[model samples]
Target: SGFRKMAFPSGKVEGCMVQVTCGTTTLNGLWLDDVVYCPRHVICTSEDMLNPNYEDLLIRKSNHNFLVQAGNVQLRVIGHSMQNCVLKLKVDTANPKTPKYKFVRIQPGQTFSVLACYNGSPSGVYQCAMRPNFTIKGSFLNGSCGSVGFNIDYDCVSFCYMHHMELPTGVHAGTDLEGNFYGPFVDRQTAQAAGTDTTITVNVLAWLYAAVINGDRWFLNRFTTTLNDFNLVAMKYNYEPLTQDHVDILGPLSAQTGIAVLDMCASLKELLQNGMNGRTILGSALLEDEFTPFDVVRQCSGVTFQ
Candidate 1:
């Protein structure tokens, strides 16, 4: 019998150590914050249970905490027995003495979306806590215990702004009147103006139509019918090898060289309302340097390009 003393400093008197051999295990002994020194041979025969499924138990006990700057965060909890689980949010403002706390009781199979805005102050903290009665069964053992585990998905922006002006009747922010989600854009004007265009020149419309009918690649391939079509299109627009400077002046249309035909159509439509003037699209003023046509489409339509 080769037995050794194992001390569990955090063990409670009520907790018993149970050992199993081929499902015939029994409780060896119990400890009270001290070593349970026993006969080496008997200890070996009985169980030496020290948090039996410790690894898996530890994983189940772990909680998820996030430090977010600004954005919309969607949280969901997985596994079984999701009662008494809570999603906690702590917002730290300029004053350390006063902090805001928002708590959401997690429901089974339900998703929670939280808008986190630090308002240019310190970032906020998000924690998913498993309170008492939030239980999950052990993988190796039948015993169930309380735990914290979650899935978090977020769409973050560089800055967060508050709406100063009231929205028009039947109009909404971050979505259309029909309730479809759109950009958390820089401002209400940009958000309102996005993708509201329908007018386009016959030549541009024909090109967009042909591209949509044939496929994106087909549209990307028709200058020499395959080689340098984008360049040819730029040339048709009187610009060769379009650059960021060209995009800034020409607007979303200038960024359309390498984009998908559908997106091009959307951007074209959107530009009509924003600032699609002769030889220049006014919406281009908002774009950054070295921006792509895809970016222009995204800005115009609030739709993410693949």
Candidate 2:
């Protein structure tokens, strides 16, 4: 071959022909002898660059970084620029050569289930993934605050997906036989669990309720009386108690049949027995601590008579 020309692989270089795809064909051309793409890639312009306006950008540095809290597989953002921030969550997959992401959005304080995840975890099932390692990308525009860009090395840039669990101690000091076993429940089981005979029940609203009730006895008395004022108690008839049906239909049965009404009255009497006064009843009652027949009745029947 005599005097054959050679074509350059100029598209790979910083300053060469800009590559473009029109339908199925690929083409290369230059705009001004200087090649330009975007800030995401290197530029091939001849002159020195002008200083870009950073006022339109976010100050997501260490000083004013976005706040992220992880709990029960959800993230809570407590930053100043949290209004309308574009947040994305992506789980890192294990496919090495073709690493992928099973991702979703980051919202307000609600437990998010990793429902549509495909890879990256102990497994891709609900609560099955012990540590579903995930990364968060929070983005925003220049609003009242400022623009937000990349995240720092720390924070919920990446964190683990954990179970929605609560410790047995602290305010969780009682068992409702539901899932709320402990915290705000300092009852018999917790007292016995800690090897004690009785536990102190601190009704946070006791003083406030007492004060409000005592402030106007006539109104309070009238309000308390109205608890049974029925005048109109709605019901599905079958689910209705015999006495409530009697109260609704103006009829009745034996004395034992109206026991529910009496028990509710007893609760009101107990509440009123304390009078319109605030005093801490430090040590409450002590009874059988384990799951007993009474506990089962309380759970199954939804009512308990002591």
Candidate 3:
């Protein structure tokens, strides 16, 4: 959206250090290798972003995987089935030399978070579904978690909210965490007219941030997972402007912005511990303002395919 230029000192290679200045934006995609694509213009699908073999892999309501980089990934595993089960993340299937992940047991209706740090385009699945008794069923979710059909119908912006967050409270609300002024309620008609994918994604992310601050353990787990998932799709797809506001919300691609991300998370952690009330942040009295543990999945239940 600003002045831009690209140069390959090594002579126009696959992807190179490029220049982008949409009002002070800097440094950044593809080849199915190290793709940090310009979110808006990448000529690829959600599955195109992930390994091709598992395109039709079984999916569950709570599983989420989002990559901040090839080196840094956030994985969320939910145990929603009847019995306790185990989960093992397999980074490779083709390499028999790759040691298998020993089973990690999880009780029913639980969520497990993994902070995976590594390099290279690693691809594989959780060995959760192949358990012995098959008494419990599971869905493995990762980078390639959306439908091309959904991505085609709506941009990553709206599509993600439909999946991760609940009904958004405000269409164009601004953040005022220290104060309780959740933006005035804009009706469905008005919000629909005034809203765009960019604004909604930004606002919903803000909403989720507050909800996470206010939700319980399970909700917090899913909310962060959903937050990372939303950030993954939004940033990678170039769905919105990568500004200080968004960088503050979504975290940055490199260590430069990681400080802000960490500080924000820490500050919020303190706020919750300091006796902040989530119900107030939610403004539940404002409407059906319920932020239950299952809120993430509850919000996504009825999306009609186009």
Candidate 4:
């Protein structure tokens, strides 16, 4: 009892510490004023106190002070569907401190899938965030004059993916008697539903090919003449009236009859027909609005048909 020291608890204050412990550990007392422990914590605290900043100034402030922040205007960038990708964003350090972005340095006419983000600062308050985008990147992406590139080059090619390409309107129950309603491409291993062979890549290329072919008049004519000769050769071997067996060698009769090679060739010929040029007799788009029975092989996919 004689060897004892007595002292009242130091009531918690802004800069005070006390014996803090738990169970078997005698933890040290607090060193008030938010004393940082780790090296990282000390560095961050020092930076934050020294550099108080302001960011995320709205672009719609209208009073960017400089008054030059275009909204929803199309640009031309070298990528996909954006009119411009590289633009300068400005900062206001003085009164009204509202920030403005002018797109001073941007790649015009490009497509960006995710939103474009930009930030600039005068003080810390000069920072800004804008979600502004162009009204129409369609034409520019097509490479028309005054056209910028898309943020991504392949964005225009993938337009169908955005609008839901080639939907399966005819959902039929699977049955052998349904005359071969080839079900959508199924992924049995994963149980994940996959589309049929008619994917967007297929559709776009199908048209792009048509565009290339129609670019020349004589070339189209020659293509037709060459294919017809091969078709006749196929007929000479099988007078089977070009049934599914004669076309789909995987068919039992076709595969067993020693005519699978010819059948395969014919199928390939039919596959070649599943395409079209842009302009038609009535000057309408050549593609069907939706899927159809003749889609596997388009009627317009003829030699020099365009």
**TM-score of model number 4:** 0.16
TM-score, structure 3 vs. true: 0.17
* TM, every model: 0.18, 0.16, 0.17, 0.16
Local accuracy of candidate 3 as per-residue lDDT tens digits, 166-271: 1233222211111111223211212222132232233333334434443422223212223354445545433333245544434322132222343333333333
Q: List candidate 4 stretches off by more than 4 Å.
A: 1-85, 92-137, 140-200, 203-271, 274-306
Q: List the lowest-lDDT window of 10 residues for candidate 4.
A: 121-130
What lDDT score goes with residue 25 in model 1? 20
Model 3's alpha-carbon lDDT is 0.23
lDDT of each: 0.24, 0.20, 0.23, 0.20
Model 4 agreement with the true structure over 18-62: per-residue lDDT tens digits? 221112222111121222000011111223423422121122212
> By the lDDT metric, which is better: model 1 or model 4?
1
Give stretches of model 1 more than 4 Å off.
Answer: 1-160, 164-166, 172-216, 221-306
Question: Whole-model lDDT, candidate 1?
Answer: 0.24
Clashes of each: 2, 8, 3, 43
What is candidate 4's CA lDDT for residue 42?
A: 11
